[PDB]
Amino acid sequence: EVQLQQSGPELVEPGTSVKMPCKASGYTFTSYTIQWVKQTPRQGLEWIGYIYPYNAGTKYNEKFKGKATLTSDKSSSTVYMELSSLTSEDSAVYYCARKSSRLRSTLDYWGQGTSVTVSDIKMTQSPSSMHASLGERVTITCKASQDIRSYLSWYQQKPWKSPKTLIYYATSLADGVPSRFSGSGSGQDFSLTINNLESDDTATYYCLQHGESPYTFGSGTKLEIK
């Protein structure tokens, strides 16, 4: 039901400006903030900022201040992001994700990703990459720098695909997620566990914190099956 449409890839020469939409449908548009996340092979997922369509309120990452500008259009339920002075290190995929204004909530639904190519709290994931057979147990550790009161979420990202939410609030199962995935931990130590494995489970898992103003992701964990 909930869906966040996005435009296709755009080729832009450096020094210009670009804008992409995040047309959202299937829910009360003004009740959910739209968060923008960029993903690069050398930095992984990176939080840019959000906009609250209810009161046009915004909040930007310090390292993306000025570079990105977020606007909302209540009539068409669309949110735009503008990048000014496109520098060479901007060829990445920009995601727009839905997140409720509730602190416990996380980025639940994501856009497909617009591959744009141009011409704090440190969140540490202990296992960089791991292997497992068809039915073993895996566990991913996500030790944090500072203390976050269980404001941690786990995401699964298939290759060339938008990430999918698994755990929010460090223990709560997300919608549609089978009980095989189980989160645990609080404070600074968090863990994600998968009891029964399948060929689907071959993906990269990220842990995201939203306890403090600059949201930070983990390095990720490439999990391979057989």
Add this chain to the structure above:
Amino acid sequence: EVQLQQSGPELVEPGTSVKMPCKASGYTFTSYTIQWVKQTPRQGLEWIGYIYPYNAGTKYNEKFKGKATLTSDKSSSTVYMELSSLTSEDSAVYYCARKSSRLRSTLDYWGQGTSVTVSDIKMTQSPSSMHASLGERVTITCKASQDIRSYLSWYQQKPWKSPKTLIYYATSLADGVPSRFSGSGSGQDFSLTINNLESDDTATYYCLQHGESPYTFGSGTKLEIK
């Protein structure tokens, strides 16, 4: 608190038209209909009509249609009555009285009376006039033509004064009237009893029915004390 102000006496030659105000204060103006009553020495009191300021609804006596028209001015809390084609047989005192929209209510408060001079159900008040000393019982009867489900009121009018309400709903005491006054009866026969008389109680007593569309007063009753 509740006051219904009127204008002074009018000296008007025959054939013209006159309008008099009924500026009201002390209550919610739109909640009470303003009723207009004319008084001639040879026909007593006659009901002209009423205006409901809530929706400007009118209802005139069949013998006064066309001759009188009622207008409501909500901004100034004033009601005007316009009399057109002033015949010689129009020299009378015109009273404006407040009556609630509730069927049980009656004309509770009256204006001072605008003396204008130009250069069906029948009420039977059996005892025309009586003489009594300072302490006896007196009974007035208001035998009706048709039946009225206790929709009868008793009014006291001192000479050269506006009528004062005593009994409404044929049994209920009005506001501020001493318990000496007592009304009784229902259907077609109604009674008014005065417990102990005083030199003040000498006045004219009328019985008004409002059980049917044309309101009709009684013939009157002159009470003399000692």
Add this chain to the structure above:
Amino acid sequence: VLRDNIQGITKPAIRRLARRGGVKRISGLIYEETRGVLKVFLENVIRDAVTYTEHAKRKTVTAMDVVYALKRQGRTLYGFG
């Protein structure tokens, strides 16, 4: 499965509703806005009513449930119980 049924509230029907409301002239863009507001109102009332039926472990929405939903949205309805 039912789809696009908000188009069933035709333009003449909306004009009739406006006429009952005393509207003399109607702009061409009124109809889509009216369809949107009607859809929002209906979604709210139906959600409350379905909650009421689900609590009673029923699978049929009764007139009592709709009346209760309207009452709890401050829209008391007379004549259905």
Add this chain to the structure above:
Amino acid sequence: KVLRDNIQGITKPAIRRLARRGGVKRISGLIYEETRGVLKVFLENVIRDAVTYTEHAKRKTVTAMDVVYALKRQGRTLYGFG
């Protein structure tokens, strides 16, 4: 004692301040009397309900909780007084 002609105590600058808090930029000269009337009506309603609540309790002092009840009764819930 007897109080008389106190709605005039809601002066013009007070109404201007209230309008400014509402984001009003320009105010017509006839707004003040209309605002005084509206405030008088609102106060009459709330005070009548509060006095009824106090009367039922066989008290002679209008407590703040009576005002809270009167406001709550009119869909005007007030926080911070009980």
Add this chain to the structure above:
Amino acid sequence: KIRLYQFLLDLLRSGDMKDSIWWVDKDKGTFQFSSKHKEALAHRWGIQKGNRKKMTYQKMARALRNYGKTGEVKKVKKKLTYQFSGEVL
């Protein structure tokens, strides 16, 4: 109840709307309907009874024929005329 002949008696006794139904012999109780205003009389009967459909003089007259069994209203051989019985007079 039986209010139909009560209606037919009341307006004749009160002299109301003589253009449709009127007297020639009050002693025996005979009366004559107008061939033109009898539709108005039937309609005024129907509005009082507050039925669903406006009734014609045919449906009005259909009722009088059941009165012959009881004897209040009977039809004699004379165009547009009936009469009450002595008891209901």
Add this chain to the structure above:
Amino acid sequence: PHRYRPGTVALREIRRYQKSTELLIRKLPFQRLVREIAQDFKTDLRFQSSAVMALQEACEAYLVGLFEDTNLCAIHAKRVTIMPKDIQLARRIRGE
């Protein structure tokens, strides 16, 4: 041929529909719309006929009141044509 000047037929319609009481939306489209809306919450639902009737009557009353407020807003702006902006202003002031 004869043609009524604009606004006369509209005034006749206003007088006519303010005098009657039947539902101004056909029953079948509204039933379909209600079932479609309820499909989102619970699948394989069921509706009493009186339930759909109550829903329709509530919707008619709400829309008629909203259109009265919209007409008042339009008259406030020295117009006789209601526009979406008047609906929005009325809904905003009502608190919706």
Add this chain to the structure above:
Amino acid sequence: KPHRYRPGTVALREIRRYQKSTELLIRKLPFQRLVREIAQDFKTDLRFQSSAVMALQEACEAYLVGLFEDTNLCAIHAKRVTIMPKDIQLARRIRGER
């Protein structure tokens, strides 16, 4: 020539100031006198707690401020910037108070 501000900017300054503070904008004593006078017509020799008068004042300020926001919306709808009594009447009618 003394310095003069063009009309409109001082109004915006006042809007910014009074939308940032929370104190009562009506003098306490005149409001209390008004409340006592209004209550005189419902019961003689009444008594008011200070917190009661304060709660009444808080309610009145909130109500008037909300009504003024609605009035401003109505005035802007009519392509104006000056609120007039007709805007107040329209807002109160739509709200259901009239």
Add this chain to the structure above:
Amino acid sequence: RSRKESYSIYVYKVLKQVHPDTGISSKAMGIMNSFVNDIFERIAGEASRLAHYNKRSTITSREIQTAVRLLLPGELAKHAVSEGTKAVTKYTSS
């Protein structure tokens, strides 16, 4: 098959008492049923709140009178209070 227990017969008695000749339809009957239920709920709930505020455990005619005063507007409250007082006075004398 559970004896629905409406208000129809009492409303019909009142109607025949106040307008001996006019009837009433089923839809209007149900509407007046709903009206009586709604007013009952309003007055009873407000009287319950009144008893709760004053730390009383019983609802008396005083509570109902105050609820009527608080809920009905204008002369409606005055006439309803008169009717209730008269009924209670008559009932007390048995």
Add this chain to the structure above:
Amino acid sequence: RSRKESYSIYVYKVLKQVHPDTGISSKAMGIMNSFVNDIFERIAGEASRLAHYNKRSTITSREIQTAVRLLLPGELAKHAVSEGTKAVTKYTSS
């Protein structure tokens, strides 16, 4: 001395749980007290109405959950339902 019996201490415990170094003023304390009382009254009254509608005489966690669904908007209802279910599940295990 009358033992007003407010919610102040529990709200302070919650505040110290979420914001360890942040205090709260007396006026804000009273406002949050009023908020808690208002929400409790709303949910309890609506649950009582739900129990009455289904001819039940008891208020269970099901009535409270349905009330929470009915009066809280959006994700507030979802998270309140999750919290209540977690608390009841933990309490049942004693």
Add this chain to the structure above:
Amino acid sequence: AKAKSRSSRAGLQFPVGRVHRLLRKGNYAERVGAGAPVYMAAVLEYLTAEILELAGNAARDNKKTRIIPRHLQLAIRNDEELNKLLGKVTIAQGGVLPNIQAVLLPK
């Protein structure tokens, strides 16, 4: 002794006993006073009588035999006190009051 309804004792048409039972089983108070059902039954009867009389007058003014919901709506909406009491109430088959703004009317 001979059974006597409390309604008859109070001289009312509405059921005092049923109102008492509804008060007792309605979760309103721990106890219910003796005169409370009588008082509230009298109030309900008064309101019913007033509305029914107004609706009957409206029906007679339309020359109709029976009160239909339209007449009830006309009775309530034409009375300001009754309109205030039933401001947020929708009446089935009620329609609306006939009202046209003066601006829409032609010159």
Add this chain to the structure above:
Amino acid sequence: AKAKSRSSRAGLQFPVGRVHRLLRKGNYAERVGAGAPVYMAAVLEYLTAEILELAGNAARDNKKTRIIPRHLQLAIRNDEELNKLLGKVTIAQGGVLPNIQAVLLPKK
């Protein structure tokens, strides 16, 4: 046996026992279930926690270490769900949100 508060058993900070007493004495039902006060306390605690966290964040962004009614108003009115829940609620000394209509601002 040593007395254990029902709040501690349910892992709560709000009083389960007091909530149960208020439910029983509040004229809501003939009887109250065992888990009803636990559920009620959990919901109340969640709501107060959410409002308090938002108000504390608002105070911190204002460089204050004490929540005042203004911070509560800022927390509520800036959240659409909380504003909808408390739409008809007045907060004393809470002020109003800073909002100026666009057309009132100077053009150039």
Add this chain to the structure above:
DNA sequence: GCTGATCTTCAGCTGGTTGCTGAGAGTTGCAGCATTGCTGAGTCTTAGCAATGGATACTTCCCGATTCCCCTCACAAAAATAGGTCAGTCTGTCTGGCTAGTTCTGTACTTGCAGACACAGGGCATGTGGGGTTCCTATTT
């Protein structure tokens, strides 16, 4: 249109203070624990009705194209009015004290309401009938 100088306001920093918040001592009232019983709620089975689905024929309305008229909107003038300054004035506010009228607390007790039980009549679900009503055809003036 594009800055530039001048004046005003707002934002930030630092020291004195001050009233307001948090924590500790005393205590007391209510939550928790342990029984006891009994009834309201859960479970099964099935009667009974109402909702759903399809068909058919008839009625009612809806949709798109045309014409044109009058309403809305852009625009300029006028003429009405509100806002900004300022000198003068008046009133709110703060301080504290004194009643004294009102509210709160404790006792004795009394009066009215809940509980239990027998039972009978009121109210609900059907039903039966008078006085028409309706509908279509045929017959006799």
Add this chain to the structure above:
DNA sequence: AAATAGGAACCCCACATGCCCTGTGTCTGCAAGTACAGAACTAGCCAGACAGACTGACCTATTTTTGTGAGGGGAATCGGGAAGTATCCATTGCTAAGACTCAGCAATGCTGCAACTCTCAGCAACCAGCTGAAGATCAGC
């Protein structure tokens, strides 16, 4: 062609009947609420200074109102087709009644500890003063 008969369903409003369950009558127990007395407490009134908010005049700018006129948006019309509707029948499924059972909740008494009140120390916030940046305003080239 108008008037009259008449068979045959049918509708509205009483009126009757069977029955069953719930409201009434009666008695008993006991606690909710009341009358009274005394303590305490807090709201109304007094009073004086004083500083800052309020008020009325004046001038001007800037906002609203009024009078144009054009044009394209919506109303009025119409005719064919598309749904809507009424009714009729069959199916099915789902809601509640009735019986049975027992687990959870009320009621009760005792106790201990958590929550209330009262207090006071100390510190976050407030105020005053000062300074620097931002922005409004009036020429000017």
